[PDB]
């Protein structure tokens, strides 16, 4: 029976491949060769954010493009103020090891995670004026990877047990379980419709999940090694991945196919974080080679390099309104680039 | 414009407060030395750390020679650790507690050590080797039923190193086999590593009263080499 199951699974797989081939026809590059290149985008450092103690893993821009929160191995959840380069708050975590950060779009809550299998929730606007633990969401086993706020009361969070849990801070219970990945999921991003997200595991695959019904609508494949960077396109019908094999793809949700590879031979180390800009001609991606660069998402061309970093780059976030981008590397530094 | 003025003043006040607190946290973060425990599934991690506590993650804090260390017993995770082991890059050293009696998993132990040394982000940090379960090894070598020569045919074509320092109450057979295990790890240790990070093996048992001293010595040597390289004295 197992042989028949494998045979029919292979039949379905090659049927999907044949459908993809039939729905390919023409490539994006051939039809997009008439677009003007972006060209070199010479970008300097504006104000450096030096307040962190150890390596920085995650940062998230706020909705107002004013204040943002970042991670550090010390156990700090510092929230910065972009224009004035100021510390608005400092949340000391119980667990020193943290790997994820999210800022609630309502502007009153900040999340965190880490090896402790606890996706701790903190509040900001409080009567006493001091931050505190709002709710200690628990239930995972594997290490926690990325978290984002669906709304003011629910968070979707990715762990290291190949299971993704959607929560409810008010009840502290796992509303839904997304068990469709084989390897550990690294990063998931929020589509503007706040009903869909894509989860990328260490099996070089990205599987699309829907928030409401909680099932894997579709999957995306084409990478060679583990992927640890993700972000939706602002329109919500595209998303680019950064793996460890120095390749960035671009899969479209509607067609379920790879579009193009963002790579060059001289790059030998993989991408860590990605962040789509507000328009599309700008595609940013960090690199292990002590620097971060920006790709042209429609012409497969590098446009400038945000050099000036020591150690590895691991986080990348452009403001919602597109004023600037903050890149944090392992040197406990955050830099603002226009 | 007065509202913007007072808002900016409030943010600057918050900054001075937070910077004072963060400098206070600076004074302690570097003081604590991070350590990491890795090894076989039954390798003696939790019970050794529990034993030395008297002097998910099963953390621990202890004070030796007026300097504080942090030992991590990561056990609340899966058996895949290709990815979260990168978080421990800025860690003073790695402890490698390995089974010494059960030779069946010794090959897996060799492979695990070889992977740790040659990793492309752990090459900066040194590795400390604990050959735990010495009483069991001594007891079971005396029986001789295991036939250690089976799992490694080159075990016989070997003699004790000239620099061997056995305890007077030991046995030539157990010591000869035991230094065989050490040397067969160190041939892996020397084969790669261009002076950036050093391996220091220490013969330790689960219940020992001087386990902390060996950790102190190893971390002292590792930080000494790193710091001398940091200057021009190399």
């Amino acid at each position, epitope marked *: 029976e197992l042989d028949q199951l494998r045979q029919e699974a292979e039949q379905l797989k090659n049927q999907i491949r044949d459908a993809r081939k039939a729905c390919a026809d023409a490539t994006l590059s051939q039809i997009t060769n008439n677009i003007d290149p972006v060209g070199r985008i010479q970008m300097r450092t504006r104000r450096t954010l030096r307040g962190h103690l150890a390596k920085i893993y995650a940062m998230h821009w706020g909705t107002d493009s004013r204040l943002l929160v970042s991670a550090s191995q010390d156990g700090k959840l510092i929230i910065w103020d972009s224009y004035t380069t100021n510390k608005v708050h400092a949340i000391p975590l119980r667990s020193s090891w943290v790997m994820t950060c999210a800022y609630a779009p309502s502007g009153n809550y900040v999340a965190c995670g880490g090896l402790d299998n606890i996706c701790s929730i903190y509040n900001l606007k409080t009567r006493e004026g001091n931050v505190r633990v709002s709710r200690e969401l628990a239930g995972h086993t594997g290490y926690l990877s990325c978290c984002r706020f669906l709304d003011d009361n629910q968070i979707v969070t990715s762990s290291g047990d190949t299971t993704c849990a959607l929560w409810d801070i008010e009840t502290g219970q796992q509303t839904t379980t997304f068990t469709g990945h*084989t390897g550990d999921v690294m990063s998931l991003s929020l589509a503007p419709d706040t009903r869909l997200f894509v989860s990328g595991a260490c099996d070089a695959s990205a599987k699309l999940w829907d928030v409401r019904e909680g099932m894997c609508r579709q999957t995306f494949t084409g990478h060679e090694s583990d992927i640890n960077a993700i972000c939706f396109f602002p329109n919500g019908n595209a998303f680019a991945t950064g793996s*460890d094999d120095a390749t960035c793809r671009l899969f479209d949700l509607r067609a379920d196919q790879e579009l193009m590879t963002y790579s060059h031979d001289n790059i030998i180390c993989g991408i860590t974080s990605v962040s789509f800009s507000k328009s599309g001609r700008l595609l940013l991606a960090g690199y292990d080679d002590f620097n971060c660069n920006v790709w042209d998402a429609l012409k497969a061309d590098r446009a400038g390099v945000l050099a000036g970093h020591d150690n590895r780059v691991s986080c990348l976030g452009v403001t919602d309104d597109g004023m600037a981008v903050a890149t944090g590397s392992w040197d406990s530094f955050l830099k603002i680039w226009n | 414009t007065e509202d913007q003025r007072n808002e900016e003043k409030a943010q600057r006040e918050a900054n001075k407060k937070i910077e004072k607190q963060l400098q206070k946290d600076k004074q302690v973060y570097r003081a604590t030395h991070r350590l990491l425990l890795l090894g076989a599934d039954n390798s003696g991690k939790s019970t050794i750390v529990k034993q030395m506590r008297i002097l998910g993650i099963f953390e621990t804090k202890f004070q030796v020679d007026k300097v504080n260390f942090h030992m991590f017993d990561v056990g609340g995770q899966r058996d895949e650790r290709r990815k979260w082991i990168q978080c421990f890059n800025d860690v003073t050293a790695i402890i490698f507690v390995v089974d010494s009696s059960d030779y*069946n998993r*010794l090959q897996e132990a060799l*492979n695990l050590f070889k*992977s740790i040394w040659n990793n492309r982000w752990l090459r900066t940090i040194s590795v400390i080797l604990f050959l735990n379960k010495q009483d069991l090894l001594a007891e079971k070598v005396l029986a001789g039923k295991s036939k250690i020569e089976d799992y490694f045919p080159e075990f016989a074509r070997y003699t004790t190193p000239e620099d061997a320092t056995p305890e007077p109450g030991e046995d030539p057979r157990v010591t000869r086999a035991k230094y065989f295990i050490r040397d067969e790890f160190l041939r892996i240790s020397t084969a790669s590593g261009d002076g950036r990070h050093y391996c220091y093996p220490h013969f330790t048992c689960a219940v020992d009263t001087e386990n902390a001293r060996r950790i102190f010595n190893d971390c002292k040597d590792i930080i000494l080499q790193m710091n001398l390289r940091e200057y021009n004295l190399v």
Partner: nanobody
Amino acid sequence: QVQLQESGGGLVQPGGSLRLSCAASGFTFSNYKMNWVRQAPGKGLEWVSDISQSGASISYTGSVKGRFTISRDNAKNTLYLQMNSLKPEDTAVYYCARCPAPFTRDCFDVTSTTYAYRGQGTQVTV
């Protein structure tokens, strides 16, 4: 998509020869470092032998030194493992493993849990 299919392997008495082939797809064969993993019945998972990018970095496990022979064909995306003079204990299942990261020498694929980049395996019985 990355696939690793193993070929060969049959019921052979102690002695004789067996040919084992790995069918590789979805990735670049040359740069990645590849190794084989064994699975003794009622026991855990282990490693067989590894070949680096150059092909001149052959190393052997302690169990087999002159008994085994590892080779690969980068042009045809095939990795080979030559058997001769088998023993009853080597009654494992042979998975075509591969270290994930390009251009490196480290991989943790001795995991018991289902690692992504290794095949369904072929049974060899002695």
